């Protein structure tokens, strides 16, 4: 296997477990408006690439 092929290998990065009725950022729904930076859109996970 070349280096390219080695880099085309799927890698497990994260593993998330969302639970209902948690009211956490993982289950907080996308908001209609964003009026302040203190009330941003909440995300489950974030990944800086590459």
């Amino acid at each position: 296997h070349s280096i390219i092929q080695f880099l085309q290998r799927p890698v497990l990065i994260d593993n998330i477990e969302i639970v209902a009725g948690t009211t956490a950022d993982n289950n907080t729904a996308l908001s209609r408006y964003v009026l302040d930076r203190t009330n941003p859109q909440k995300y489950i996970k974030q990944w800086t690439l590459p």
Binding site: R32, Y33, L35, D36, R37, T38
Partner: protein
Amino acid sequence: SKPRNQNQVMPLQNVPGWGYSLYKGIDMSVPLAYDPNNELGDLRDVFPSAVDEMAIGYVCGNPAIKHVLTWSTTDVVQNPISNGDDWGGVIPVGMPCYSKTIRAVKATSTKTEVMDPAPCEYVANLFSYWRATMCYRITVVKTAFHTGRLEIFFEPGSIPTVRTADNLGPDQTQLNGTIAPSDNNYKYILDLTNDTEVTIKVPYVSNKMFMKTVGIYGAHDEDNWNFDESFTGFLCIRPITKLMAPDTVSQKVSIVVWKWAEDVVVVEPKPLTSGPTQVYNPPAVARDL
């Protein structure tokens, strides 16, 4: 060797910057370059995509979510689903925006209105009049054990509104099956037994060749004409059959609605707004202005 002039006297006009607002013409801009014929190459291997992302059909063809409603087992039949989001059940058909929130901060209380536009609305805000075929993808977030019948019908003309001092909203009392029968309205009855989705294209119909791009901008109890004149009508989403769900699943489902436009036409390159195009930059905290 030095003959005489035989040309006539040219009439002229010292009008610099003639047609600078047009897109076509020969520009008198001096290039701070070496070659007057300076010109970049074509766009091969510049952007990640060789597609033209600047065409109106590619921008207004990018859908965005505008409605996420909550259809509970209590929702009455032939009543618009008004739980979960603003403008509940009603969908003003048009490229302009219909929804806005008011940020009120402080003596006094300064109020600025914010919009949540899809790319079609972002584009329409740049012009005075529009004309397009509006396309809506109505998806239901459910399981294989939720069943129900959903009625999506188109009503032309103005919308029943509960007009406020700073905003407009639909009057859900004038949209019940008693006051607003769907028997003489184009509609699509959707079964949720197994399917979840229907895309609905609404062609352009109006007594005008072009509608306005104002929408909800400055719309309230006193300023309400342009809003009504900015849309061809509205869709209403009402249950034909109550939501059916055992106690092993959720007693509610979420109705997601994507919005985009096709066969688009924009008329005037000037907005119809009181003020200019301005982007809302959310401040750091809720105290700022």
